[PDB]
Amino acid sequence: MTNTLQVKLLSKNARMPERNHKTDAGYDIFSAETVVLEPQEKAVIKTDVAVSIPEGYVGLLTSRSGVSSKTHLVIETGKIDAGYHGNLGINIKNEHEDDKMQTIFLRNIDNEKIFEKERHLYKLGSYRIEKGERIAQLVIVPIWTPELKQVEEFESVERGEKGFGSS
Amino acid sequence: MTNTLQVKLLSKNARMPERNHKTDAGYDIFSAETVVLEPQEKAVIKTDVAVSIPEGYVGLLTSRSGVSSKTHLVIETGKIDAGYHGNLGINIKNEHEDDKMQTIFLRNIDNEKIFEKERHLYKLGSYRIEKGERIAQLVIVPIWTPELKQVEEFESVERGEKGFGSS
Amino acid sequence: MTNTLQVKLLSKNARMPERNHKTDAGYDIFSAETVVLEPQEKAVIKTDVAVSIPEGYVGLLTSRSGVSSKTHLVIETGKIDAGYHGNLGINIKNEHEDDKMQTIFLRNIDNEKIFEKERHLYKLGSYRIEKGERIAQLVIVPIWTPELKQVEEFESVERGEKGFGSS
Ligand SMILES: O=c1ccn([C@H]2C[C@H](O)[C@@H](COP(=O)(O)NP(=O)(O)OP(=O)(O)O)O2)c(=O)[nH]1
Ligand SMILES: O=c1ccn([C@H]2C[C@H](O)[C@@H](COP(=O)(O)NP(=O)(O)OP(=O)(O)O)O2)c(=O)[nH]1
Ligand SMILES: O=c1ccn([C@H]2C[C@H](O)[C@@H](COP(=O)(O)NP(=O)(O)OP(=O)(O)O)O2)c(=O)[nH]1
Ligand SMILES: [Mg+2]
Ligand SMILES: [Mg+2]
Ligand SMILES: [Mg+2]
Ligand SMILES: [Mg+2]
């Protein structure tokens, strides 16, 4: 049949993607690892989840408005090709500045201070993404993949070359 | 009928979205508030506009090439679910560095200095987004929302696990 | 016929976009110029390539997971309107911090040090994008462009106003 997406859990640490509502457009993706990201630090957070997006579609592995509005964790949107059967990685950076100051509080993905019994010194603006937290979503859209034809001029001429804030 | 989108203006400060051309793919969104963003400062700029995206679609509340190329104002693309009837917020950050230096000129969304009769000291790289300025656009695309089926291996095996700059 | 996209090479420095696989969702875009980007520096890298996206579609000129995961080069996704026949520009920023330190090594788009016989002093975190390197991709998706109808309340009431990390 159609209207079905294959998903493969690559470890015990993985979790099956879930739609929040029937109305909602994507599936929440869970982190399969606990990671501390210092200011300006980049990482590819593993999900231990693979999918088989069929042809004529592309998967947008993208941020959640809750995480992106509350924290300086920035997720560059991954375009999951209709073929990539590997481990989905979340391309992330802590875009907080490295101002050289210290603190004893990490911050969670809701920007709340993490209280812990054992005291540790962290760089200010550091985040902990915990195993099993919702940090991304996958929205699947159809694509158009025609063959390209080189030309010296186009088929028809109103917008033209105007762009980059021309109105 | 179909081919119609409901829009609700939540205040006098709101404005109806507009297509720039017939050719263009999205609707320009207007700020309903005047906001100053210092370097590294994050905000959710209200539009006082709500919409009812019908099911099988998602709305991409996204940047304009003019604003994003000229300024360090970065808009994280919001995915407006086919259901969210609330106030559309523009998830924004001033990604200019906080170098500790001062100036008397704010900068507008075209990166032009704002001249004002009364002198004030601002942090360098600060922006003023004025009420009624075009700061974002909404592009609506169809989505594919199938039911997920867990598997141990996929239906067919060429790309495979290769990614993250493998070619 | 349909299922064809017109492309126009605006100079000798341009190159025709290419699909990596048959499975893949987009066309790799090549830089038509050699550019050095210092920390925090913004640019619009020219491709010397134009396209005619037909109506009912939009082109996402977007990052590659290889470049974005390995370097601090951030590409803001351009929405190419179904009409824009101009030179496609890659809206890019070097999001590496300006920590005031120096080095003799530029970095390429794989984050590898560039060894050169003549010694030069660069700012730390500077990148060289060379003419003919793959720095972006174009994914084309269909759009929905209805006429807007203003209302005081919506046609039907479960999600409602809930958002920005409400679950
Ligand atoms: O965030 C991401 C982005 C991409 N990917 C995977 C999916 C995609 O099929 C694959 C390659 O994506 P891109 O074509 O955008 N990156 P690049 O062109 O550099 O790699 P390749 O040379 O393999 O195409 O990497 C992720 O798992 N997470
Ligand atoms: O920039 C934005 C992003 C999202 N939104 C709204 C639209 C969407 O329906 C809602 C939730 O979007 P996400 O699912 O991407 N964020 P999150 O998953 O954190 O919130 P929720 O738990 O409500 O799904 O927030 C905005 O108004 N502006
Ligand atoms: O990265 C980009 C982004 C946009 N563009 C072009 C394509 C698009 O048709 C045109 C305008 O895009 P936007 O509507 O998103 N920018 P803006 O609304 O500021 O400019 P205009 O006033 O011309 O619509 O600029 C690029 O070439 N590269
Ligand atoms: Mg959600
Ligand atoms: Mg526009
Ligand atoms: Mg920054
Ligand atoms: Mg590719």
Residue numbers in the entry:
A (entry chain A), B (entry chain A), C (entry chain A): 1 to 157, 159 to 168
Copy text verbatim from the article accompanying this structure deposition:
Asp95 is responsible for chelating a divalent ion in the Dut threefold central channel, thus we produced this protein using two alternative protocols: the first of which included MgCl2 in the purification buffer, while the second did not, allowing us to evaluate the structural impact of this ion. We obtained crystals in the presence of a non-hydrolyzable dUTP analogue (dUPNPP) for both proteins, which present identical space group and cell dimensions to the previously reported crystals from wt Dut80α protein. However, the models built from the data obtained with the crystals produced with protein purified in the absence (Type I) or presence (Type II) of Mg ion showed small structural differences but with relevant mechanistic implications. The D95E mutation induces the reorientation of the new Glu side-chain in order to avoid the electrostatic repulsion between the carboxylate groups. In Type I crystals this is facilitated by a short movement consisting of the side-chain rotation of about 80° around Cβ atom that accommodates the Glu carboxylates deeper in the central channel, however in type II crystals the rotation is much smaller. This is because in Type II crystals a Mg ion occupies an almost identical position at the central part of the channel as was observed in the wt protein, while in Type I crystals the ion position is now occupied by a water molecule. In Dut80α D95E type I crystals where the Mg ion is absent, the conserved motif V that covers the active site was totally disordered, even though it was occupied by the nucleotide. In contrast, in Type II crystals, which retain the Mg ion, the motif V was visible over the active center with identical conformation to that observed in wild-type protein, but the density of the map was lower or even absent for some residues (Ser158, Gly164, Gly169 and Val170), supporting a weaker stabilization of this loop. Furthermore, Dut80α D95E Type I and II structures confirm the proposed allosteric effect between the threefold central channel and the active center, showing the fine correlation between Mg ion binding and motif V organization.
Instead, SaPI derepression is facilitated by phage-encoded moonlighting proteins, which bind to the Stl repressor, activating the SaPI cycle. However, this assumption was incorrect, and we and others have recently demonstrated that the dUTP molecule blocks the Stl:Dut interaction, allowing us to propose a consensus model for Stl-Dut interaction where the apo form of the Duts provides the competent conformation for interacting with the Stl repressor. In this conformation motifs IV and VI provide the recognition and binding site for the Stl repressor, meanwhile the highly flexible motif V stabilizes the Stl-Dut complex once the repressor binds to the Dut.
